Design a protein around this nucleic acid. Sequence first.
DNA 1: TATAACTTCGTATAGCATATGCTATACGAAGTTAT
DNA 2: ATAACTTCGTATAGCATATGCTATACGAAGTTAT
DNA 3: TATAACTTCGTATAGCATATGCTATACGAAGTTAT
DNA 4: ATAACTTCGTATAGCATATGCTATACGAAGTTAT
Lengths: 309, 305, 309, 305
Amino acid sequence: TSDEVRKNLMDMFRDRQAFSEHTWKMLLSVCRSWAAWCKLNNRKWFPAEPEDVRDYLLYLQARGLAVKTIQQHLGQLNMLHRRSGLPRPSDSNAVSLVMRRIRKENVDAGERAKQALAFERTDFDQVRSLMENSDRCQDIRNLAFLGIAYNTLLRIAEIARIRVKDISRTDGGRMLIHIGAGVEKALSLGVTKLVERWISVSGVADDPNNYLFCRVRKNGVAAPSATSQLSTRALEGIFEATHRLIYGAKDDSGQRYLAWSGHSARVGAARDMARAGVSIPEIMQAGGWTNVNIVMNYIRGAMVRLLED
Amino acid sequence: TSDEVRKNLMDMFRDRQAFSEHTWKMLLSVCRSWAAWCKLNNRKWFPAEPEDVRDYLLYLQARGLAVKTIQQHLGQLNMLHRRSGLPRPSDSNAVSLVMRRIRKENVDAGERAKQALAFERTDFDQVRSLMENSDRCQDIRNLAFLGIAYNTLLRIAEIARIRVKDISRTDGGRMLIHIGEKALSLGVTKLVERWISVSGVADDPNNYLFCRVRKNGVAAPSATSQLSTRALEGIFEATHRLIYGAYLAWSGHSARVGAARDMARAGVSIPEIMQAGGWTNVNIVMNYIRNLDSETGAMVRLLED
Amino acid sequence: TSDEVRKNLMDMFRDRQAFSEHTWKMLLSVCRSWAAWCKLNNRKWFPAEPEDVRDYLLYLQARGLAVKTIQQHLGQLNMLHRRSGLPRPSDSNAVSLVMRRIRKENVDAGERAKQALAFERTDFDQVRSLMENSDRCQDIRNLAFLGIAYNTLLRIAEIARIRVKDISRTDGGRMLIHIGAGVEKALSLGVTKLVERWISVSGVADDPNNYLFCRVRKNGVAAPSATSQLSTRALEGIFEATHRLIYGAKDDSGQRYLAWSGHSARVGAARDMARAGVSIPEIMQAGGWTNVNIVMNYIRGAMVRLLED
Amino acid sequence: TSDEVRKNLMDMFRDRQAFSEHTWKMLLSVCRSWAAWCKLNNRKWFPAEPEDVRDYLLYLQARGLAVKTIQQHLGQLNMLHRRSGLPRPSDSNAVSLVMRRIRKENVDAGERAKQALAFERTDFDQVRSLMENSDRCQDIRNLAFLGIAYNTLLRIAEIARIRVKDISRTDGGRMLIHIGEKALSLGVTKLVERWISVSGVADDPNNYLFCRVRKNGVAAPSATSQLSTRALEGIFEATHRLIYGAYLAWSGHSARVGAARDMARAGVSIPEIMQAGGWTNVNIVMNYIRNLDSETGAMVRLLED
DNA sequence: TATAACTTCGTATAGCATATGCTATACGAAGTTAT
DNA sequence: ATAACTTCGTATAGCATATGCTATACGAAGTTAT
DNA sequence: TATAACTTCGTATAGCATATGCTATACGAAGTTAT
DNA sequence: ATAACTTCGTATAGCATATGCTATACGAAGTTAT
């Protein structure tokens, strides 16, 4: 294949918006490291040579990256090749076996996927109990955001996307939110008030095409916008700040999940629903998950009872 | 091999009973619109070249059409090309890409499905009261229809097909409706009679239940032709314009949506709402009863003690 | 393809036991009618010509056969072609469209799949209430068979296959039966006695490798066998006889399902479990069904209540 | 292209860590048995010709082997042929046919999976009583094991891996077990101690919990080598031969099966029996608790009023 | 014997399961080391 | 003219799906200890 | 101004959905028939 | 010799799986009304 490859590649970039901005972000990323690696070793980065890719994967493993990370590089590589006509590195025994070997040894050595710290009902009550009394715009928002996070289990990006017009109400007085027909998420009577209070303190409702959450400057003034949203990077800040607020500084180990993050309310809610007897699938749906293992990991005497009697 | 596709269009025309007239019309409709776009932009419409179709699809997106619509177009174009030894345009990667992009792009722009305006018990009551004591042969027809609809939760094409004999009786007076069965409440059953008499469709069991009513308050019963579905739709619309003046009004399925909801509030086994309008996608029925208060979720339930 | 076809066909017959005896039975059957038809019309039955197959399908339709029957012929034909190398008639627009057209017109004309007459709990109680008092071997068996049919919902062929050795018991005294590891079916206390009574009146237990149900001659003497079983044709007789016993002769319309048959206990049990509130999947499993529609067809005021108040 | 497959066997050997030693042994095992059959019947074993393999599979069926076993054979043969530019034998239609026939044929003949002899509370009690007051260093070990097993519902390879420090304490005395966590009852926790002392594995936290016990009632604690799984299996067997004399006895997973059952009788959330032995196939756990009386079914329930 | 009670047989038509391998345990049994 | 539809064209929402088998349904004809 | 409170950016790593068409209804609106 | 294993070979039972994406995690660097 020749001009074909250059053309197949050319078609991709044209309709690049068929993929998520993050897929592109990662593609380019993995490519930079793949090329960097090839460079430092006198090798042709495209098309990728199986034996080269193998060496590369073993190099990342050796760099101590996570199995799911190594899987990513291999994947983007595979994406770049399929999408362009040529055969994928995963097509060769060398890459395929080494991947599985890399997976096996890491797991065998104890490496496991890190889980997020939960932001449960209790945590919400405490946070609420504390910030409930603030007049600060910053706080009224943060409290309203955490409430929505918890109540709905919506990904931070989904919350950051919410538009005022997307806010229906129910005959109960209970707020409702549409996530793109899509899905309707109903807030409790208590959270609806939290959101009501932030809506009335920022004046985001001054334009139904405005995003519900917006930045709030140091002088306690909201900056609504219908074109730009609050960075999910910031929604993550609200989670981290609120945690510092209560538990202070993060131990300098550098590890992940030493404070709340995007997942926190989701994983936390899954547990409360569990302890409360909710049905597993009930849980699944709410969290938008498709599988039973994701919800299960999040939740973790039987025999010790039978015996003792 | 041009004889190859020729033979196929003959095949297609010979066994056209393999598809619904409806389905066909949509097809001719797509070929019509596509062909025109092709003429206007000097491109060969048949066989449709991928790059040409991709351009077309990008065009429809600008037309402002929904994804389900643009896919209708891509879909029909895909049908005949397959029902001819030709490669379907979705089998090109350029079209696969645009269809994928067009989607995300559109959802991001804020793509929302249409919402049917519900016709709940509350509205039925208000309409009943308003034209309950009316003599206009039409009003009587219109109410008995609004009744059959909200009660049977039947589809309009189905109600238009009802004849004088699909009816059976069973309890206290109320009738039953054979179908392609249904039970009517007593309140509505009392309605579907006043219409039957002051219409005289009873005069012939072959005659359809619902029929035309010329401007003279005079019904034209018949067993040959039946009230168009669009006409039944007009009863829903009209009735609305009657109460609120000129998916903003009511349509053929406002009664189905309204019944599910009213039931959902008296709390009803969700699958028991499938009996209602013969449904699937336990979700579609949800997409109706979503903003209900009993459908708030365990989270709401948990949070409020 | 040439000798290849003759070889592919030759491989099939060699390992013909890879298919059910019924599949073979039908293949040969459909082939006889296909050839008969081709013959009467001066045509080559193999390989089959699409336009010929179309004519054939329209001929069966015109003969008034059931859509599912016409689907069968088309299917066996397709089986014979794929399995032998050549392309299947369903591969041509003519066959494919005509099938769908045939399906459409029949259904549009009202033709629908006939369902079996149910043999429910009440029916069982009555039958039991009547035959309970017989000493006749014939009856003690028939009653024990109907009981198993109802209690377990096992296909008649599965019952006819049951071997004495396949009969475990529970700590309750309740009989248990294994259907080939497989599946265990537990009989109630009442049915276990019925089966106990037939086991003790025939002496089938004189050899664990014997089939539970066996023929019983006119002189009330069981004929156990571990090699031969009671024909499912007979298990169907037990169902028909018991019905005649209670409702007398079948109206000479000739139609199917004017008396109980193999399905009867299955379809009947599905209903009782329904009316009793059993879960849909619960039902499914017991009947061995994989789908929700099969169990639903078997079971068939909402709004009439809301309105009337 | 013989270099093509050569490169592949090099690939396979280089990254052999991609598979478990166990998995490999089974493979060498299959190649061993196959190769021999090939030599004996003068057929080329590599690449394996379909007709040759079909004959082989038909041979194994006569050997009396189970379908899961014959498929093991067909499976491994399929693996290397794919991990070499060669066509897998299952990719022939002759082998596909026999594998299919062999199946039905075998199920018809009466193919039943093996049944694990359960080690229930009743048996644990009987064994406890019998060697509760014994001094033999082994007996103490054996009981503490039978305890850990029925209590933790752990797999044998997992119990063999237990060290002196995976243990944690939590309530009244009972210990906890870190794992690849577990909680022990008080009764068993009292047992797992007598073993720890009269063994002195405590002397070193690296030492494994369970260890060898030479014929002199003398334990050989160690943190380098661990008790083989087979040894743990022997404790289950021996203990049985002790009570009933010489799937007839108990095996490495009789304790797991027994615990599920005993629990199932005290009625236990079926998924809550997955906590027990980390299970899936809600059915496998069923295939254990099947002949239980609470697992009779709604039919039984309905029939008995 | 005539006959119940089947079995077998062919055409019509209804009711389903859609996987495979990697890795663990099974269990007789040859191999090994310290009593 | 105009009420009251019907027919049109095209938008878009709501329902199951396809094979490839394997098994029952039932009248009739053949079989065997009585 | 210094600065809160972000936004953007790149590498690391966790969490999912896997369809498409046939046929019905939608709804403005041109076409038709009897008042 | 023999108890008590360990190592072997091969039978057979019990557990999740593979892509192809798309999204969060978080330190750090760049940006803007205060």
